[PDB]
Amino acid sequence: RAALPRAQPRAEGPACVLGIGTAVPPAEFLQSEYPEFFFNITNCGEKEALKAKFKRICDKSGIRKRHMFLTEEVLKANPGICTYMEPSLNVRHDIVVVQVPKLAAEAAQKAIKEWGGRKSDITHIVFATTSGVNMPGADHALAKLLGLKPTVKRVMMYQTGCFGGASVLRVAKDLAENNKGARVLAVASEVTAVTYRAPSENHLDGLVGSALFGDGAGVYVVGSDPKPEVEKPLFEVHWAGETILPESDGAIDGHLTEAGLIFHLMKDVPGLISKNIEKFLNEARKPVGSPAWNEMFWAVHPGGPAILDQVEAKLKLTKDKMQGSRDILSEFGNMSSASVLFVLDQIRHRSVKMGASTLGEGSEFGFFIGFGPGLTLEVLVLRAAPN
Amino acid sequence: RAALPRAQPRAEGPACVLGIGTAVPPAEFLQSEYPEFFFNITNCGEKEALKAKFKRICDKSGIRKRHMFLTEEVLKANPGICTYMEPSLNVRHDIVVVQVPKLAAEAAQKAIKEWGGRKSDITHIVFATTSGVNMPGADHALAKLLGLKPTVKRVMMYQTGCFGGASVLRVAKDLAENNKGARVLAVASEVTAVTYRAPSENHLDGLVGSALFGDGAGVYVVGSDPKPEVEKPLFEVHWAGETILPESDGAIDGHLTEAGLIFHLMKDVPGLISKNIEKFLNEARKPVGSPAWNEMFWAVHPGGPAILDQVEAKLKLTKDKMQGSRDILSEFGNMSSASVLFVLDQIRHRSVKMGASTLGEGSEFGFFIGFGPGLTLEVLVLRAAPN
């Protein structure tokens, strides 16, 4: 009985980010004007105690603006979504079934462009989202929008939540390192029409939800062994891993109901993360020769200000490390799994505009960190290319 | 700027199925008696032309029995599920969010036993289903029921459709080959509570799935580089790919709505597959030497009696080739993503019973085939072990 040579040849070098696209819906929503607009569009102008809490939450949120498909026109066209808990899922999916892949496609056009390659050389799609499900999936719907080959290989991760963007890089790492010439679209696209609802005293978590969640789509082209000259690695992926946090069970709960997606939080998510994150990162550090924290860049899901402040504190980070995360939070909100894809792009941009030595603000290695239900913490260790 | 050794060591050998488990809810439903049961318990037991249209569908079905959680008791307690279009997604999810992973755990205990490994050595889970979504996902649920490590890497493919069993092996392949030591639970679990619905003359398609769908779960242990004497390979995975069939857009649409998962079968599905299967299968042959069709075994997703009959005919396969798929059809119905994992297992059991030279009824290479929305055709190429 004869052993065989690997019939699908594998690649050699680390999986590399080769191009980055991002994309948001056109409409901006200032956060100073948002308490009025939201409570008025949801016929809840009478709940002034509630509306004041909402304003305080928005004023502490670290967000200047968000982009949102749900313009006034749309919400008026879709009254069910403007209620608290009337049966609305049908008309919510009619929106996101189309708009989740439309958004990703826009971002994919730009990532492909930065990459330099040919569409027909795209061999894998790895797609996350928390904004609805369909059959066929957004991955199929994307492939048709881009005219990819019919043999593109797909991994559609519906319903991930805020660690999803870490996940797609994790998966894309194995798909790229294990397939000669594989070029992967790692894709995270998010549209809020599945969680949006009128505020209520019974749903504090929908109030925070209504103040932080916004729309966005990031896509990376991911591949090993870049053709020298013809492709430019932005970032090398050297480590992927995740973990359930201790004593965290029940923390975040996400339920897809007749009235759309509803979150309940019963545990201090920022404290569970800040308390438990040094230990895990201490492991992810070892393969790249444990750098000090402040020698590394920090592409950290901007879930809110709470998480970013406490981690920075617990780890004694210099306040530039989180600047890219806070920038994205401010200009776009919590875009769920897409958010952390923007944050790294932004770290890359802050590197050129300041003239740093590496695309990680002068750091060689950094972290690419997601987090979401289960209290899963996802982290990748990336290497920044030279400038 | 140095090049660095792969920080997360890759494996060497091909990805091998090391253990196999399945599980089904205990209640059995003889298809001879089913249209009597089905139509009465849905208060439709009056529409006598519908009922006869549906009996002739079950008789053409090649199904003798199915397993379903939805007993008489369970349906009386969830009267919503027993209606055509009343909102019912909430009650549906209350079932499938505990049952989908509870079933997978049942099958996974078995696969882990056949493997021989310690649970603490599971490093990855890859889970497919079409039966609800949730956050955290069924993947994390299954990990918690099995007491797996908190560091287990996870890939949760909700809403795959009948091609997800092949999808999980394909992901398992890469995760297992790109990670030295990796041991991957490859999981597919289905429970019809989400798609169940009463008959109606305005839902033509729903009658098809009401006659074929059934509950079941399959899980494989997948890894590269087996410990000799200790772990024993049953199949090696040598190729994985997929394709969208030409001119097939919309042939299987599935929408998750307020009244549950609803299906739209708007093409000849057995035709579309038969017309295009040889071309693409001819390409999957080539890296293992293009064996003749009738020198290979056939683990084919048993979408229905018409698909297996037509592919038998188009490829002129000897009649022994499909028997494993037809058995799984006869005794479990169409279990969607799980079914094809049962088929391969049934092919292995048939091999032992007949004393074949391989676990693929004598053939050395075999196809592991799934299909669904897209039209997506997913194919793996496996190598059966002696004896």
Say yes or no for a CB contact (<8 Å) between B159 and A133: yes
B381 part of contact set with chain A, CB < 8 Å: yes
Alpha helix ranges (H) inside chain B? 34-40, 48-59, 72-77, 89-115, 138-145, 164-177, 204-212, 269-285, 305-314, 323-332, 339-354
**Residue B26 and residue B71: Cα distance in Å, rounded?**
10
CA distance B295 to B140: 40
Distance of CA A186 to the CA centre of its chain: 11
Helical axes B48-59 vs B204-212, angle rounded to 10°: 50
A1: nearest CB among B244, B374, B386: B386
Rounded to whole angstroms, the Cα distance separating B153 from B170 reads: 16
Q: Would you tell me which residues 256-275 of chain A have a C-beta closer than 8 angstroms to some C-beta of chain B?
A: 256-258
Residues of A numbered 108-167 whose beta carbons fall under 8 angstroms of chain B's beta carbons: which are they? 130, 132-137, 140, 143-144, 150-151, 153-161, 167
Q: List all residues 6 or more positions away from A202 whose beta carbon is below 8 Å from its beta carbon.
A: none
Experimental method: X-ray
What one-character DSSP code corresponds to residue A385?
A: P
The end-to-end CA distance of chain B, in Å, is: 52
Q: Which two tokens stand for residue B42?
A: 């849905």
Beta-strand ranges (E) seen in chain A are: 15-23, 28-30, 65-67, 124-129, 153-158, 183-190, 216-223, 235-244, 252-257, 260-265, 297-300, 365-372, 376-384
What is the 3-state composition of chain B as percent helix, strand, coil, each rounded to the nearest 5?
40, 25, 40
CA dist list (Å): A31 to A56, A209, A307: 11, 13, 20
What are the structural domains, with CATH classification, of chain B? 1-233 (3.40.47.10), 234-387 (3.40.47.10)
Give me the residue label for tokens 């049966």.
A87
**Can you tell me the distance from the alpha carbon of A380 to that of B94, in angstroms, rounded to the nearest whole number?**
34
CB atoms under 10 Å from CB of A219, counted, come to 32
What order do you get walking across the sheet with A124-129 strand by strand?
A: A153-158, A124-129, A183-190, A216-223, A15-23, A235-244, A376-384, A365-372, A297-300
Q: Which of B173, B8, B237, B186 is nearest to A124 (CA)?
A: B173
The answer to whether A291 contacts chain B (CB < 8 Å) is no
Q: How far is CA B331 from the centre of its chain?
A: 14
According to DSSP, residue B194 is labeled G
Minimal Cβ distance to B174: which of A3, A178, A386: A178
3-state secondary structure (DSSP) of residue A319:
coil
Contact across the interface for B171 and A170, Cβ inside 8 Å: no
DSSP per residue over B314-383, as a string?
HTT--TTTTHHHHHHHHHH-B-GGGHHHHHHHHHHHHHHHHT-SSTTTT-SEEEEEEEETTTEEEEEEEE
CA B114 from centre of chain: 20
Neighbours of A119 (CB within 10 A): 13
Q: Resolution of the experimental model in angstroms, please?
A: 2.6
Pairing outcome for strands B216-224 and B296-300: unpaired
Tokens of B175: 């995760």
CA gap A215, A211 in Å, rounded: 12
What's the rounded Cα separation, in Å, for the pair B69 and B193? 8
Question: Residue B298 corresponds to which tokens in the numbers above?
Answer: 């056939």
CA A220/CA B229 separation, integer angstroms: 43
Nearest to B326 by CA among B64, B30, B129: B64
Give the integer Cα–Cα distance in Å for B157 and B137. 10
Residues 6+ apart with CB under 8 A from A79: none
Q: Which amino acid is at B44?
A: C
Contacts 24+ apart (CB under 8 A), A114-119: A114/A18, A114/A19, A114/A20, A114/A21, A114/A221, A115/A18, A115/A19, A115/A183, A115/A221, A115/A231, A116/A18, A116/A19, A116/A230, A116/A231, A116/A232, A117/A18, A117/A183, A117/A221, A117/A231, A119/A146, A119/A147, A119/A148
**B162 labelled catalytic:** yes
Q: Does B2 touch chain A (CB under 8 A)?
A: no
